[PDB]
Design a binder for this molecule. Sequence first.
Ligand code: FMN
Ligand code: FMN
Ligand code: 4NF
Ligand code: 4NF
Lengths: 313, 313
Amino acid sequence: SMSLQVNLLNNTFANPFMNAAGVMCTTTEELVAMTESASGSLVSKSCTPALREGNPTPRYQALPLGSINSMGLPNNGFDFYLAYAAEQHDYGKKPLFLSMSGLSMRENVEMCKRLAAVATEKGVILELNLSCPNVPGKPQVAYDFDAMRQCLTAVSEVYPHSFGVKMPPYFDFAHFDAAAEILNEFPKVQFITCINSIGNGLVIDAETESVVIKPKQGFGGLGGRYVLPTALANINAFYRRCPGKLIFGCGGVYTGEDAFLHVLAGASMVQVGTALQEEGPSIFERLTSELLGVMAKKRYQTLDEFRGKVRTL
Amino acid sequence: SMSLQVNLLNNTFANPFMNAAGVMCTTTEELVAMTESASGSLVSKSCTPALREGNPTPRYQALPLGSINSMGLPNNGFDFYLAYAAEQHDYGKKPLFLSMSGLSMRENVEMCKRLAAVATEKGVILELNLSCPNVPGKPQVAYDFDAMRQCLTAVSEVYPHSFGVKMPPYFDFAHFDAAAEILNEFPKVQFITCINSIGNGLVIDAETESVVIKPKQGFGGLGGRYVLPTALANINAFYRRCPGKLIFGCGGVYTGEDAFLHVLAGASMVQVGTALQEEGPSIFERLTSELLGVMAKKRYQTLDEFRGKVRTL
Ligand SMILES: Cc1cc2nc3c(=O)[nH]c(=O)nc-3n(C[C@H](O)[C@H](O)[C@H](O)COP(=O)(O)O)c2cc1C
Ligand SMILES: Cc1cc2nc3c(=O)[nH]c(=O)nc-3n(C[C@H](O)[C@H](O)[C@H](O)COP(=O)(O)O)c2cc1C
Ligand SMILES: *C(=S)Nc1ccc([N+](=O)[O-])cc1
Ligand SMILES: *C(=S)Nc1ccc([N+](=O)[O-])cc1
């Protein structure tokens, strides 16, 4: 009598779970493993026009309360992910998202021109990353509203399909309002993924009296338990301000209960990063089971019964 | 063989610990209790020109990983805190900071003009709050760099003493650079307190399917375990970029080990919020004991030996 089914953008998803871009989605082996998993969908590693080796190691550290990273967009390059979407992915198993993270507006425009035909033919869906906080000297496009509007205009001009945007967290209603106003100008922006990491935290190991990652003097994006209330805030803020769009939640999901909170805040899909990095794709079997358990105890049969229904006081 | 003594701003402090502004420092009884505690200093509740009731309750909630609040600047008004500084505080016991949070430039200018004489005569030190994330309709001043420059210019023009600024967290090196550039233009800003809460998080209780505080649809500032890596990042970022100024740490301190991390990142004083709210002023006896224990095990005698000495890779 229950279902985790999600229906959006002319697709049916068996459940709302997928990986967060960047986690377990860089290589062919990883993409196949995600496709064979119990997840409802998957997204490929944020790509640049050419391959990148990324930042020096160590560049990721798991922590009691989450994780810190400065990966620096290590990826196989756009051609590789385009080929996976065009020729290898089994769409009969689940829908596929492709994450794009060009290092300039022109880079994104040029990749989008080429992605267009594959989206048309095969149905891959674009998630445009406006938020990488780890490439040295590169600005957070989404923290620059003028730049964001220009980039979405440029992409919209050449990309004849719906797409979504991956956003960094905001921390002020003025910013939520400004960002929402811009996103609402673009009807092709049909979903907003909240959130990328909390940027530029600094973890210090008391025992070693040192930072724990090599790039950028130890500063890196935070994920995991640290970020859940910030993620819920951003999911709900955009759920409220962009009623014409769907929200994908990302941040702090370890359990079915955490997923329940994402959906209550407004999420349609729920992405899993840090927890997936630590547990592997088997996590999706556990999460679907747990979310159904939470729903059964609460007497909910479907996600639409409580999506966005968080009660205020 | 050891000492927690700190010497700064023409004052001597027995140890680096003090309350965070807003926590246990609103009433006469609270200010006396802080003065009688083992803390090295104390700061009075951020004040407005007149008494203020603050936001509707519930407006604070303790959490497993910290706290969320939207107090809304409940305070007894500037006259009350000025009178405490001028007539009641025992400067023989410890130095006193007064936190100011006018709701406009004019309000801060007018309060500073009156504060000047008491600072001259009694030695109270101003901590100017540029970061409160809980007043409905009024965004963080320090998230508007032009507003920040104009507030600091006004205060510097009318206030004939050194002072400090309480800052919200930043999450991007471009913002650390921009904020530091502005702060460095004001020689009277002799200390920077990093950080105020991580603004506008949203805590949802899975059991009640609701938010946990009443104001602003449940959106409120995060404190406690959630914010420690963000606090360390901000402390260190400004320690590096504002070499002519002192950094005061605030965020996620529950133990002597946490305090040790603040100091390693660059902190001179260490402020305690959520943990003090939950434990009461007796916490300062525990924190001084724990910090000395950490230093003993590490064979450090003084704070100067490791302040700002966090090792990078
Ligand atoms: C190792 C690692 C690599 C990541 N790579 C990407 C990326 O390529 N693109 C992206 O949009 N986000 C990336 N992220 C951010 C995640 O997608 C996610 O937004 C963040 O980790 C928060 O989710 P979590 O709390 O589930 O980890 C990465 C995160 C981690 C830990
Ligand atoms: C109940 C409460 C009241 C606060 N009031 C103030 C305030 O009046 N002025 C201010 O600058 N910060 C205020 N803060 C923020 C704290 O000073 C501190 O920056 C923040 O809680 C992070 O420290 P923590 O992790 O030790 O809680 C308040 C925090 C709490 C929880
Ligand atoms: C808008 S998408 N333009 C853009 C993309 C990426 C960068 N970057 O180098 O971070 C800048 C501008
Ligand atoms: C700076 S001196 N004054 C000030 C205080 C508060 C605001 N505000 O936005 O509420 C603006 C300027």
